[PDB]
Amino acid sequence: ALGKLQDVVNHNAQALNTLVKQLSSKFGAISSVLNDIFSRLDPPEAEVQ
Amino acid sequence: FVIRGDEVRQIAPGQTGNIADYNYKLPDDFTGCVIAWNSNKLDSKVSGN
């Protein structure tokens, strides 16, 4: 009956979940963990990484 | 100064090693240049310099 209200909440929750789950993508880099980057990549390379 | 030949790569930012830790350390953001070349006929005698 009132899906036109429910769709707004669905969209917002879905957007937030997409945003947080995007924290795991490496973007082609070594890792998505800043500490891992700092540990494995020398500071000169770690800066760009 | 003078070091061993195998440590010429050790003189660089983001390096790890003995002379880096306990003889001479360079900053990560170091800007400049480095020159190294065998000083056998200068700092090497068969008796040991």
Tab-separated table of N, CA and C in Angstrom:
chain	number	residue	atom	x	y	z
A	1	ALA	N	0.819	-1.205	0.000
A	1	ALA	CA	0.000	0.000	0.000
A	1	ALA	C	0.855	1.258	0.000
A	2	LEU	N	1.916	1.289	0.816
A	2	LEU	CA	2.691	2.558	0.942
A	2	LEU	C	4.158	2.395	0.525
A	3	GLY	N	4.451	1.554	-0.472
A	3	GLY	CA	5.807	1.453	-0.953
A	3	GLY	C	6.497	2.738	-1.330
A	4	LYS	N	5.739	3.806	-1.585
A	4	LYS	CA	6.362	5.063	-1.970
A	4	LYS	C	7.087	5.719	-0.807
A	5	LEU	N	6.760	5.342	0.427
A	5	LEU	CA	7.562	5.742	1.577
A	5	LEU	C	8.728	4.792	1.796
A	6	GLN	N	8.480	3.495	1.636
A	6	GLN	CA	9.492	2.488	1.918
A	6	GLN	C	10.668	2.593	0.967
A	7	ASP	N	10.421	2.998	-0.280
A	7	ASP	CA	11.506	3.040	-1.253
A	7	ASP	C	12.557	4.069	-0.871
A	8	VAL	N	12.147	5.172	-0.243
A	8	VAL	CA	13.110	6.180	0.191
A	8	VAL	C	14.074	5.588	1.206
A	9	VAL	N	13.536	4.916	2.223
A	9	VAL	CA	14.386	4.323	3.246
A	9	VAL	C	15.256	3.237	2.642
A	10	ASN	N	14.699	2.455	1.719
A	10	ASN	CA	15.495	1.425	1.062
A	10	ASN	C	16.671	2.043	0.323
A	11	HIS	N	16.417	3.114	-0.426
A	11	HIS	CA	17.484	3.762	-1.175
A	11	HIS	C	18.551	4.305	-0.244
A	12	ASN	N	18.146	4.930	0.856
A	12	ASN	CA	19.137	5.525	1.743
A	12	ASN	C	19.984	4.458	2.424
A	13	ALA	N	19.348	3.404	2.938
A	13	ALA	CA	20.115	2.340	3.574
A	13	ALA	C	21.046	1.667	2.575
A	14	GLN	N	20.561	1.437	1.356
A	14	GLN	CA	21.385	0.826	0.324
A	14	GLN	C	22.568	1.710	-0.036
A	15	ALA	N	22.348	3.021	-0.119
A	15	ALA	CA	23.439	3.935	-0.423
A	15	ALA	C	24.495	3.899	0.663
A	16	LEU	N	24.068	3.923	1.924
A	16	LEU	CA	25.037	3.904	3.015
A	16	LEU	C	25.814	2.595	3.044
A	17	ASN	N	25.133	1.473	2.802
A	17	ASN	CA	25.827	0.191	2.774
A	17	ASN	C	26.821	0.124	1.626
A	18	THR	N	26.444	0.631	0.455
A	18	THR	CA	27.392	0.690	-0.649
A	18	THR	C	28.595	1.533	-0.271
A	19	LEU	N	28.349	2.671	0.373
A	19	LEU	CA	29.441	3.558	0.740
A	19	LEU	C	30.409	2.879	1.697
A	20	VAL	N	29.893	2.195	2.720
A	20	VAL	CA	30.789	1.565	3.687
A	20	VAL	C	31.500	0.373	3.061
A	21	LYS	N	30.772	-0.462	2.320
A	21	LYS	CA	31.390	-1.609	1.674
A	21	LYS	C	32.432	-1.194	0.646
A	22	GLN	N	32.354	0.032	0.132
A	22	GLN	CA	33.393	0.520	-0.763
A	22	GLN	C	34.719	0.751	-0.053
A	23	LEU	N	34.745	0.691	1.277
A	23	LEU	CA	35.993	0.855	2.008
A	23	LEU	C	36.960	-0.297	1.792
A	24	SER	N	36.492	-1.427	1.266
A	24	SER	CA	37.351	-2.590	1.101
A	24	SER	C	38.035	-2.653	-0.255
A	25	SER	N	37.570	-1.886	-1.235
A	25	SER	CA	38.171	-1.929	-2.559
A	25	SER	C	39.591	-1.384	-2.522
A	26	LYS	N	40.499	-2.070	-3.210
A	26	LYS	CA	41.892	-1.659	-3.213
A	26	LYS	C	42.191	-0.574	-4.232
A	27	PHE	N	41.270	-0.304	-5.156
A	27	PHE	CA	41.502	0.651	-6.238
A	27	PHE	C	42.757	0.297	-7.023
A	28	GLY	N	43.078	-0.991	-7.072
A	28	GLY	CA	44.270	-1.458	-7.741
A	28	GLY	C	45.536	-1.347	-6.927
A	29	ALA	N	45.474	-0.760	-5.736
A	29	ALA	CA	46.659	-0.560	-4.914
A	29	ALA	C	47.031	-1.868	-4.221
A	30	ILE	N	47.965	-1.797	-3.273
A	30	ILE	CA	48.397	-2.998	-2.568
A	30	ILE	C	47.276	-3.538	-1.690
A	31	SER	N	46.648	-2.667	-0.906
A	31	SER	CA	45.675	-3.103	0.086
A	31	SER	C	44.761	-1.940	0.432
A	32	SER	N	43.640	-2.267	1.072
A	32	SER	CA	42.701	-1.269	1.559
A	32	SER	C	42.902	-0.948	3.032
A	33	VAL	N	44.018	-1.372	3.616
A	33	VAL	CA	44.324	-1.107	5.015
A	33	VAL	C	45.525	-0.177	5.046
A	34	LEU	N	45.323	1.021	5.594
A	34	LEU	CA	46.374	2.031	5.595
A	34	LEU	C	47.610	1.542	6.334
A	35	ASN	N	47.414	0.841	7.448
A	35	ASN	CA	48.544	0.306	8.196
A	35	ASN	C	49.327	-0.697	7.359
A	36	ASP	N	48.627	-1.548	6.608
A	36	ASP	CA	49.305	-2.501	5.732
A	36	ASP	C	50.155	-1.782	4.689
A	37	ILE	N	49.602	-0.729	4.081
A	37	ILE	CA	50.348	0.066	3.107
A	37	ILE	C	51.604	0.641	3.747
A	38	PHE	N	51.444	1.273	4.910
A	38	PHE	CA	52.578	1.887	5.593
A	38	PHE	C	53.635	0.856	5.962
A	39	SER	N	53.209	-0.334	6.374
A	39	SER	CA	54.148	-1.379	6.765
A	39	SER	C	54.927	-1.908	5.568
A	40	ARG	N	54.234	-2.202	4.471
A	40	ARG	CA	54.875	-2.912	3.372
A	40	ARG	C	55.577	-1.986	2.393
A	41	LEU	N	55.014	-0.792	2.184
A	41	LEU	CA	55.587	0.152	1.186
A	41	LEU	C	56.506	1.162	1.877
A	42	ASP	N	57.758	1.277	1.422
A	42	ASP	CA	58.662	2.278	1.960
A	42	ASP	C	57.984	3.647	1.906
A	43	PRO	N	58.313	4.533	2.845
A	43	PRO	CA	57.644	5.839	2.922
A	43	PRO	C	57.572	6.548	1.579
A	44	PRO	N	58.676	6.679	0.821
A	44	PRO	CA	58.528	7.302	-0.508
A	44	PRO	C	57.434	6.669	-1.345
A	45	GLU	N	57.455	5.342	-1.488
A	45	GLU	CA	56.405	4.654	-2.232
A	45	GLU	C	55.080	4.662	-1.475
A	46	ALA	N	55.129	4.590	-0.142
A	46	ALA	CA	53.891	4.574	0.626
A	46	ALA	C	53.092	5.851	0.411
A	47	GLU	N	53.775	6.978	0.203
A	47	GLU	CA	53.067	8.234	-0.015
A	47	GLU	C	52.124	8.127	-1.207
A	48	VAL	N	52.660	7.696	-2.351
A	48	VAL	CA	51.821	7.559	-3.580
A	48	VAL	C	50.805	6.428	-3.374
A	49	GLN	N	51.208	5.332	-2.724
A	49	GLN	CA	50.306	4.199	-2.566
A	49	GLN	C	49.070	4.590	-1.769
B	1	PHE	N	82.126	10.756	3.501
B	1	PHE	CA	82.487	9.578	4.284
B	1	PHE	C	82.664	8.410	3.321
B	2	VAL	N	83.080	7.271	3.871
B	2	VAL	CA	83.316	6.052	3.106
B	2	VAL	C	82.612	4.900	3.807
B	3	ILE	N	81.975	4.036	3.023
B	3	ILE	CA	81.319	2.839	3.523
B	3	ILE	C	81.718	1.662	2.639
B	4	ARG	N	81.166	0.495	2.950
B	4	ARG	CA	81.369	-0.668	2.104
B	4	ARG	C	80.513	-0.558	0.843
B	5	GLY	N	80.980	-1.208	-0.224
B	5	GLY	CA	80.295	-1.108	-1.500
B	5	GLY	C	78.891	-1.681	-1.491
B	6	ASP	N	78.660	-2.734	-0.707
B	6	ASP	CA	77.350	-3.373	-0.693
B	6	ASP	C	76.287	-2.527	-0.010
B	7	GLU	N	76.671	-1.439	0.650
B	7	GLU	CA	75.736	-0.571	1.345
B	7	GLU	C	75.453	0.719	0.587
B	8	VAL	N	75.851	0.806	-0.684
B	8	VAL	CA	75.576	2.019	-1.444
B	8	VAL	C	74.078	2.197	-1.636
B	9	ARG	N	73.351	1.084	-1.778
B	9	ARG	CA	71.872	1.173	-1.910
B	9	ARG	C	71.267	1.543	-0.551
B	10	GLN	N	71.962	1.215	0.543
B	10	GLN	CA	71.445	1.506	1.874
B	10	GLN	C	71.378	2.998	2.154
B	11	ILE	N	72.174	3.802	1.453
B	11	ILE	CA	72.128	5.250	1.606
B	11	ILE	C	71.011	5.787	0.724
B	12	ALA	N	69.812	5.872	1.282
B	12	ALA	CA	68.620	6.280	0.552
B	12	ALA	C	67.482	6.441	1.555
B	13	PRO	N	66.472	7.238	1.226
B	13	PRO	CA	65.318	7.357	2.117
B	13	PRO	C	64.501	6.077	2.126
B	14	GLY	N	63.807	5.861	3.240
B	14	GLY	CA	63.027	4.648	3.402
B	14	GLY	C	63.857	3.386	3.367
B	15	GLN	N	65.087	3.443	3.860
B	15	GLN	CA	65.984	2.299	3.882
B	15	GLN	C	66.028	1.672	5.269
B	16	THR	N	66.584	0.463	5.324
B	16	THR	CA	66.740	-0.280	6.566
B	16	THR	C	68.085	-0.994	6.549
B	17	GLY	N	68.822	-0.909	7.646
B	17	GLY	CA	70.111	-1.565	7.725
B	17	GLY	C	70.938	-1.040	8.879
B	18	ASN	N	72.171	-1.552	8.952
B	18	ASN	CA	73.057	-1.234	10.070
B	18	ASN	C	73.503	0.222	10.033
B	19	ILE	N	74.247	0.598	8.992
B	19	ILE	CA	74.802	1.945	8.919
B	19	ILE	C	73.685	2.979	8.929
B	20	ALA	N	72.555	2.656	8.302
B	20	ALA	CA	71.390	3.526	8.389
B	20	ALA	C	70.970	3.711	9.839
B	21	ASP	N	70.868	2.610	10.580
B	21	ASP	CA	70.423	2.697	11.965
B	21	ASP	C	71.513	3.240	12.877
B	22	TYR	N	72.760	2.811	12.680
B	22	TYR	CA	73.807	3.067	13.660
B	22	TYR	C	75.012	3.822	13.117
B	23	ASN	N	75.003	4.233	11.869
B	23	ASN	CA	76.123	5.051	11.417
B	23	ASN	C	75.691	6.355	10.768
B	24	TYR	N	74.620	6.343	9.973
B	24	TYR	CA	74.188	7.527	9.241
B	24	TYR	C	72.798	7.313	8.659
B	25	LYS	N	71.863	8.210	8.963
B	25	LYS	CA	70.474	8.075	8.546
B	25	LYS	C	70.073	9.258	7.680
B	26	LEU	N	69.328	8.974	6.614
B	26	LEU	CA	68.818	10.018	5.744
B	26	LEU	C	67.316	10.193	5.931
B	27	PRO	N	66.803	11.412	5.801
B	27	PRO	CA	65.366	11.627	5.970
B	27	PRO	C	64.588	11.039	4.807
B	28	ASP	N	63.312	10.748	5.071
B	28	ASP	CA	62.462	10.180	4.032
B	28	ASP	C	62.257	11.159	2.884
B	29	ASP	N	62.019	12.429	3.199
B	29	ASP	CA	61.747	13.455	2.203
B	29	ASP	C	63.012	14.071	1.619
B	30	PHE	N	64.151	13.390	1.745
B	30	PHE	CA	65.425	13.947	1.314
B	30	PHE	C	65.408	14.287	-0.171
B	31	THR	N	65.852	15.497	-0.490
B	31	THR	CA	65.999	15.966	-1.859
B	31	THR	C	67.471	16.230	-2.129
B	32	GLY	N	67.971	15.719	-3.233
B	32	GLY	CA	69.372	15.908	-3.527
B	32	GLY	C	69.891	14.775	-4.393
B	33	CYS	N	71.164	14.453	-4.186
B	33	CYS	CA	71.873	13.507	-5.035
B	33	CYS	C	72.930	12.806	-4.197
B	34	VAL	N	73.385	11.653	-4.686
B	34	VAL	CA	74.362	10.829	-3.979
B	34	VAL	C	75.365	10.264	-4.978
B	35	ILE	N	76.647	10.295	-4.593
B	35	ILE	CA	77.730	9.786	-5.488
B	35	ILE	C	78.544	8.729	-4.738
B	36	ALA	N	78.745	7.560	-5.350
B	36	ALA	CA	79.510	6.478	-4.751
B	36	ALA	C	80.327	5.795	-5.836
B	37	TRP	N	81.575	5.474	-5.513
B	37	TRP	CA	82.480	4.878	-6.481
B	37	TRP	C	83.624	4.223	-5.729
B	38	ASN	N	84.122	3.119	-6.283
B	38	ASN	CA	85.147	2.339	-5.604
B	38	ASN	C	86.390	3.182	-5.362
B	39	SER	N	86.820	3.223	-4.106
B	39	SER	CA	88.022	3.934	-3.692
B	39	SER	C	89.120	2.949	-3.305
B	40	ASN	N	89.242	1.867	-4.077
B	40	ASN	CA	90.230	0.832	-3.787
B	40	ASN	C	91.643	1.404	-3.771
B	41	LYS	N	92.019	2.121	-4.826
B	41	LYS	CA	93.357	2.695	-4.899
B	41	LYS	C	93.561	3.841	-3.921
B	42	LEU	N	92.527	4.228	-3.178
B	42	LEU	CA	92.603	5.316	-2.213
B	42	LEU	C	92.435	4.841	-0.778
B	43	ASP	N	91.351	4.122	-0.484
B	43	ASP	CA	91.031	3.715	0.879
B	43	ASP	C	91.133	2.207	1.073
B	44	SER	N	91.884	1.516	0.218
B	44	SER	CA	92.092	0.080	0.351
B	44	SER	C	93.561	-0.236	0.122
B	45	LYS	N	94.229	-0.727	1.162
B	45	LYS	CA	95.572	-1.270	1.051
B	45	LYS	C	95.538	-2.744	1.424
B	46	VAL	N	96.465	-3.514	0.846
B	46	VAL	CA	96.478	-4.955	1.091
B	46	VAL	C	96.673	-5.247	2.572
B	47	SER	N	97.346	-4.350	3.293
B	47	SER	CA	97.431	-4.471	4.741
B	47	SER	C	96.127	-4.096	5.431
B	48	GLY	N	95.177	-3.514	4.706
B	48	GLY	CA	93.930	-3.091	5.307
B	48	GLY	C	94.028	-1.673	5.822
B	49	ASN	N	93.201	-0.778	5.294
B	49	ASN	CA	93.247	0.631	5.676
B	49	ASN	C	92.335	0.819	6.881
